[PDB]
Amino acid sequence: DKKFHGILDQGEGVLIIFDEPPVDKTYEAALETIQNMSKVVDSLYNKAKKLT
Amino acid sequence: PVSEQQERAFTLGLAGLLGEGVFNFGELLMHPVLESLRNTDRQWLIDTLYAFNSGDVDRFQTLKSAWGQQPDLAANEAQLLRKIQLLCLMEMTFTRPANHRQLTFEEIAKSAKITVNKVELLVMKALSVGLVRGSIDEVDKRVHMTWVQPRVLDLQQIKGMKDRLELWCTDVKSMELLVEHQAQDILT
Amino acid sequence: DSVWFLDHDYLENMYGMFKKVNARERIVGWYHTGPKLHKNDIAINELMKRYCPNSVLVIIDVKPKDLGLPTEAYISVEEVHDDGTPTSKTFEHVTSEIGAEEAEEVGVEHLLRDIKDTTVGTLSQRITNQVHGLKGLNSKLLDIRTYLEKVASGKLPINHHIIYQLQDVFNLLPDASLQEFVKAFYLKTNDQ
Amino acid sequence: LLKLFTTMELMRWSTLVEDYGVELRKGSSETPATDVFSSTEEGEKRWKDLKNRVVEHNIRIMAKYYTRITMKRMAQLLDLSVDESEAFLSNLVVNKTIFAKVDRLAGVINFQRPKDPNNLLNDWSQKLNSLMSLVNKTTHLIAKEEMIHNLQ
Amino acid sequence: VIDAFRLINANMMVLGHEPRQTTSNLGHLNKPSIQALIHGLNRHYYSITINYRKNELEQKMLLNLHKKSWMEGLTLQDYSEHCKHNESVVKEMLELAKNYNKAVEEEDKMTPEQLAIKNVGKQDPKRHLEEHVDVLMTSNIVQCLAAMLDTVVFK
């Protein structure tokens, strides 16, 4: 449900709670830029067909 | 008077050891007063200054007959042990360049010649007062000094500063050339 | 330099007159014109205070002492210095900035089209500025080094401010790592 | 009584109970308007409540100085048991006066914000901004300082 | 709106001092306001030239070399602040990206700006996108160059 944002470890018999990690931000900005470029590439090819 | 300088000079050193403020042991030696004119009391007095700076329990301990003579040293024996420990720690951070101002607890204990356990408490009291700043990572067992105070004024200590300044002069020259190099076609 | 000429009365006359040309021009103090700060300057500093409301001593040189401004600002200070030396009268520096009023700004901006510290107009403009900070830093290192030796040999007075300032650079500890940036551009350039 | 309380230097509970006990606990006085310390009827409970307070002060001081401390090492310091120290920390953390991370396995207590490699880089960036201001200032003091050779 | 002028008296006009002024220089007449130019010319003055000479030392002082001004170039900005900015900048491109997908489908004639407006996207959607990365790239690129350099130098 992620109603406390931890993970339960049944192999050891401990509850670990997820600490703050280093930035996800870096990956996310790259991810967003690459998806927009993929839409564009599809448009870019069609007009190009005219050349060859 | 001759006799007056001798009395005031004795109390001045005693005060100096008690100090939490004192980081000018190097200045006391440098001043002509103590060195030039010695008496039997004054022979020990300069030695105790020396023992602090070095910050070894072995040098310090031989002088112990002195601890009994004044009640001032005898009474605040805890502050003395803490002081010599802390000063040795500062000298090591200082000797070492800007690569590490990190020293282990083990290394601090060796210099101090006081047990590892008591060193850990002593270092904490110095932090608490604010003489020194840093962090203690007891997983690693290092005290990483963020900040260090103005050190003892001796000649050698003037020389320690030169080492880093000189090194810095050569790394900057090298580097300055790399910054000019990149797109030299366009600065306009 | 213990023989020089100065007209003290002139300082007083000038004060009243400058007020008519602009209200922002009153006797602030005196200017020195380099090359160093001398003992001989101290005699005039004393005198200036009486004439002026309390004065400032600004040293405006013809060529920078660093790479930036050619001006230093000073205030007379008395401080105890110990190494075998007594209490010294010295001049303690305070840092300076640049700044102007609207009239001044108008003429300099139209006239300027020079290269500057940076203008800003490209990425490449920015590197010129980076070159200039690093070169500046080289300059300061030389002055301090030659002085450290002079302190050791002569037993020149040890000013607490200098020993403390240099110490701090060393203690902070450099650490630097992970850095990245985008790469969106290719589709756009390709697009043109 | 004032001196121990005022320093943020280490204290140990036990030393205090005896030290204060001789001098302070007695609370002789002539006025009827105060005789309270531990001499009075609520005074007894007030001394019981003091155990909790001292130990909590130890936690605050250690939070700043230390970044990481071993569990074993913190219980000695506080003057608490292994279970008690781990337990006392959670109550404090939720109540919000110190922030620790408690391993109920006696592993480690982290008074730090959650470590990132990223975090450390930023702290250096600020130091760097300060470091440059200091170097520009210093050069000036050098020029006046070089002139003189009559004051040595 | 700075002119150098010379007085016209009854005596000056009879002599013909007014053409005499234009001679020996590049010649200069004023401009601001219509009423002020006709009136001024007849009664008030004749106009003549101002040109400017300022030496290289004057230019050096004019420029305002400044110590912190160059120092900033080296001064490292937060790592989290670059990451945060990188993410913010991407969010402007997203907006532009809808207009940009439509613009790119047909751009099969001449003039990119006309094509881009025609198949939806005011002025140049490509341009907007590019400016947005450039500012972020500029701050991140210089700080990385500076950071690696300082750490090694100081250490």
Curated annotation (Swiss-Prot), chain A:
Signal peptide segment: none
Compartments where found: Nucleus; Cytoplasm, Cytosol
Name used for this protein in its record: 26S proteasome non-ATPase regulatory subunit 11
Domain of life: Eukaryota
Assembly and binders: Component of the 19S proteasome regulatory particle complex. The 26S proteasome consists of a 20S core particle (CP) and two 19S regulatory subunits (RP). The regulatory particle is made of a lid composed of 9 subunits including PSMD11, a base containing 6 ATPases and few additional components.
Post-translational note: Phosphorylated by AMPK.
Organism: Rattus norvegicus (Rat)
Entry coiled-coil feature ranges: none
Role this protein plays: Component of the 26S proteasome, a multiprotein complex involved in the ATP-dependent degradation of ubiquitinated proteins. This complex plays a key role in the maintenance of protein homeostasis by removing misfolded or damaged proteins, which could impair cellular functions, and by removing proteins whose functions are no longer required. Therefore, the proteasome participates in numerous cellular processes, including cell cycle progression, apoptosis, or DNA damage repair. In the complex, PSMD11 is required for proteasome assembly.
Family: Belongs to the proteasome subunit S9 family.
Cystine connections: none
Lineage: Eukaryota, Metazoa, Chordata, Craniata, Vertebrata
UniProtKB/Swiss-Prot annotation, chain B:
Record's keyword annotation contains Zinc: no
GO MF: structural molecule activity
Gene Ontology, cellular component aspect: cytosol; nucleus; proteasome accessory complex; proteasome complex; proteasome regulatory particle; proteasome regulatory particle, lid subcomplex
One GO BP: ubiquitin-dependent protein catabolic process
Residues recorded as bearing N6-acetyllysine in the entry: K110
Origin: domain of life: Eukaryota
Keyword entries, A-Z: Acetylation, Proteasome
Location of the PCI domain: 1-150
Coiled coil: none
The protein's assembly and partners: Component of the 19S proteasome regulatory particle complex. The 26S proteasome consists of a 20S core particle (CP) and two 19S regulatory subunits (RP). The regulatory particle is made of a lid composed of 9 subunits including PSMD13, a base containing 6 ATPases and few additional components.
Protein role: Component of the 26S proteasome, a multiprotein complex involved in the ATP-dependent degradation of ubiquitinated proteins. This complex plays a key role in the maintenance of protein homeostasis by removing misfolded or damaged proteins, which could impair cellular functions, and by removing proteins whose functions are no longer required. Therefore, the proteasome participates in numerous cellular processes, including cell cycle progression, apoptosis, or DNA damage repair.
Family from the record: Belongs to the proteasome subunit S11 family.
Name of the protein described by the UniProt record: 26S proteasome non-ATPase regulatory subunit 13
Gene name tied to this protein: Psmd13
Residues of the whole record sequence present: 189 to 376 of 376
